[PDB]
Symmetry: C3
């Protein structure tokens, strides 16, 4: 009967189990993944979008730690103050409820730091959007 | 007809081929995987269990080498002598038929070394279960 | 109705999306993957073949860069001049249209360099086939 379909769904459920265990980090309904490539902010934006994903945007400590665990280099976050200087916000325009700025940040040094960078210790630093950093996308899971 | 089902099974077989090639190490009916996180023994136990897997327990040189190849840091094994000091055993209570102790091991230093650690060279060292080391689970494949 | 089949195909399409994003590098109809193990050329050949894949053979800059991005160590390419010294060719006998030799290469040093090695900077160097290097296979995607 639908024995095949039964086996397909069972096979899929385990493949998905493996992936969430070792391919990336799952926190709720988000799945953080990196292609291991560094590029400018606009590029990462296009990239994630190209995959039906969005740039990783930690909305709480758990997510921040998850991204922290995943990365081997500083990664751009889906946060900027491009439109209103000093007012950091989501790629959807939503203001942040959780922040983890590094000491002395944000400082908008050189009057040109509108992007945010997740550092290896989990802290953040505002950096120029034109710099090249690790691409990380959150996929809906 | 069942052309779709045909394609689904073919698609699944190749996805599985990719995963066994680059996601982890397959040795017989075991699939070794790591989430790249270090934690205490009890945590790793819970973790693997949480994924229908068990802590990696090499039962022969091939498996030991496979785990060795997979890891980038010392990993806990599913072996302990908690119940009977000096008598190392499986998470199922089965005694070991294969061991790869490091020189001078096991020594049960500090009278508190009931867990086993796979070192980068494949050799083993008994360590305190309360230490934090890389999590590795063997999944049924 | 075929709601399941619908869901299976949707589930598969996203699993495939994740894999092409983080498991390997896709360039056209090729999917480059590495098992992270170093071995002699003949071994890598057998390995890829064993997986219905072939040794990675960059046929253009995009592919070369893709392989370059993927690797953490020097990787053998599916190119040799075993049959006709100096005449480098595909594993299918096809002559190369794209090459990226390193300065001073190829030199066939020691009169025993019939294999090709992709270096970390993307350049190539002819090396003895008996040396052990990273295995990389291109899978049909
Ligand atoms: Ca600004
Ligand atoms: Ca600090
Ligand atoms: Ca700013
Ligand atoms: Ca700054
Ligand atoms: Ca004891
Ligand atoms: Ca030793
Ligand atoms: Ca002990
Ligand atoms: Ca010891
Ligand atoms: Ca020759
Ligand atoms: Ca050079
Ligand atoms: Ca030669
Ligand atoms: Ca040479």
């Amino acid at each position: 009967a639908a024995s095949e379909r039964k086996a397909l769904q069972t096979e899929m459920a385990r493949i998905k189990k493996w992936l969430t265990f070792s391919l990336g980090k799952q926190v709720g309904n988000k799945f953080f993944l990196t292609n291991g490539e560094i590029m400018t902010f606009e590029k990462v934006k296009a990239l994630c979008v190209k995959f039906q994903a969005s740039v990783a945007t930690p909305r709480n400590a758990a997510e921040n730690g998850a991204i922290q665990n995943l990365i081997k280099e500083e990664a751009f976050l889906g946060i900027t103050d491009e439109k209103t200087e000093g007012q950091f916000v989501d790629l959807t325009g939503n203001r942040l409820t959780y922040t983890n700025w590094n000491e002395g940040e944000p400082n908008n040094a050189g009057s040109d730091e509108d992007c945010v960078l997740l550092l290896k210790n989990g802290q953040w630093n505002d950096v120029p959007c034109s710099t090249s950093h690790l691409a990380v996308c959150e996929f809906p899971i």
